[PDB]
Amino acid sequence: IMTLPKIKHVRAWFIGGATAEKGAGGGDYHDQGGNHWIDDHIATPMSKYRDYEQSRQSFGINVLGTLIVEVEAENRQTGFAVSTAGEMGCFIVEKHLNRFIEGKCVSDIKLIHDQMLGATMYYSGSGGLVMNTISCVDLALWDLFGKVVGLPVYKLLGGAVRDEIQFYATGARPDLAKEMGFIGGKMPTHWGPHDGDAGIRKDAAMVADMREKCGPDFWLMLDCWMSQDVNYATKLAHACAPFNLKWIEECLPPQQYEGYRELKRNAPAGMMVTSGEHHGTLQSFRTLAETGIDIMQPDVGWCGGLTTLVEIAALAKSRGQLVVPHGSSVYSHHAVITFTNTPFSEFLMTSPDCSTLRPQFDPILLDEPVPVNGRIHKSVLDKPGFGVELNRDCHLKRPYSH
């Protein structure tokens, strides 16, 4: 019988964000520099305002930065993970959650997860910042456990059900993504309800253009980042039907479950409606699943962690729905490669012009794998835990201690 150490210390650092270096990248996908496609007139709930139409950074999509949580066992072995929360995430970990973590067995992952959820229920809002922090802790625990046992997380979960993960790429250049070997390209919408028919025409034209350049079998999708309403989304979906748009994603703010139900009903035959990257907690996904949307897309570092993701996958599978996580690099890879209902995954372009395979969480993760020819072979994930190390060369800040 293998002997397991207890958890000795949990620490939290951050990089980027409003109190550090802007454009740090890492865990915060949107903490980028200038001239980045991810900040290029992307439609949002705020783009209706002239001062916040051109840049999401201008309204503060980058204020949080990256949260880093590292758990150390009594035998000095460490595990860690990253997410979006930054300094505030550090407060929550160092001043609150540490009490449920330290002293526990490295295998007490689900127990710590339940305690974190129960203890923060009064201020977590079931998603966002607080849940992102909880997720980071959950992931750091799985990493530590795997590194202690000496097994990749995907094997602890029950093994891979496919020999490689195939990816679609999210970014402004589906055509370049096809050349790279991805199976599809998801583009962000640039116009919203306030732009009316002109907005619909322009984004639909963008899709038509890529369909011409990419051929019929390369998938094309639209990401709407909570920026629309039911009528606008319905018009855009129908305007893109002639081009076989595979799915239209996150058209509405997360609380609008009733709206999603209606939008799905209004969708063109065969076109899928998806959402979920901003939802958190298993119960929220139960409600989301019942709206009838086709694919739920939780972010492993935002939905509650791997522990929660695995439950969401089961929920989707029980209904014949698919689960395709939002980015998340290795934190998603080790999980989805074991899900029969996750036939493909997402690679969210961090490359400013979507022309190169810059790592998903560059540069906070050392030896972070990237898709090669649009795929990641399971052997690439054959490393303890989530298989990566923390890049301490980055300027990690420790705002709190205990």
Chain positions contacting a copy of itself, by CB under 8 A: 18-19, 44-46, 49, 52, 59-61, 63-64, 84-85, 87-88, 91-92, 95-96, 99, 115, 117-132, 226, 253-258, 278, 280-281, 283-284, 286-287, 400
Kindly tell me which of 163 and 258 has the beta carbon lying closer to a copy of itself.
258
Ligand-binding annotation for 31, yes or no, is: no
Annotated active-site residue 326? The verdict is yes
Least distance (Å) from a copy of itself to the CB of residue 395? Answer: 18
Q: What angle do CA 72, 75, 77 make, to 5 degrees?
A: 45
Ligand-binding annotation for 72, yes or no, is: no
C-alpha 160/C-alpha 264 separation (Å) is 32
Selection from Mg ion, a copy of itself, none that 372 binds (CB < 5 to 8 A by kind) is none
- Which H, E and C letters describe 164-233, residue by residue? EEEEEEECCCHHHHHHHCCCEEEEECCCCHHHHHHHHHHHHHHHHHHHHHHCCCCEEEEECCCCCCHHHH
Selection from a copy of itself, Mg ion, none that 281 binds (CB < 5 to 8 A by kind) is a copy of itself
Least distance (Å) from a copy of itself to the CB of residue 88? Answer: 4
Ligand-binding annotation for 56, yes or no, is: yes
Count CB-CB contacts under 10 A for residue 51: 9
Asked whether the beta carbons of 72 and 11 are under 8 A apart, the reply is yes
Ligand-binding annotation for 368, yes or no, is: no
The yes or no reply on residue 223 touching Mg ion (CB under 5 A) is: yes
Which among 113, 190, 278, 326 is annotated as catalytic?
Answer: 326
Selection from Mg ion, a copy of itself, none that 43 binds (CB < 5 to 8 A by kind) is none
Residue 68 β-bridge partners: 13, 82
Least distance (Å) from a copy of itself to the CB of residue 321? Answer: 17
Q: Tokens standing for 319?
A: 């209904």
Count CB-CB contacts under 10 A for residue 297: 25
Ligand-binding annotation for 249, yes or no, is: yes
Asked whether the beta carbons of 71 and 144 are under 8 A apart, the reply is yes
User: Active-site residues: which are they?
Assistant: 326
- Contact positions toward Mg ion, by CB under 5 A? 223
> Which residue ranges make up the annotated binding site for Mg(2+)?
223, 249, 277
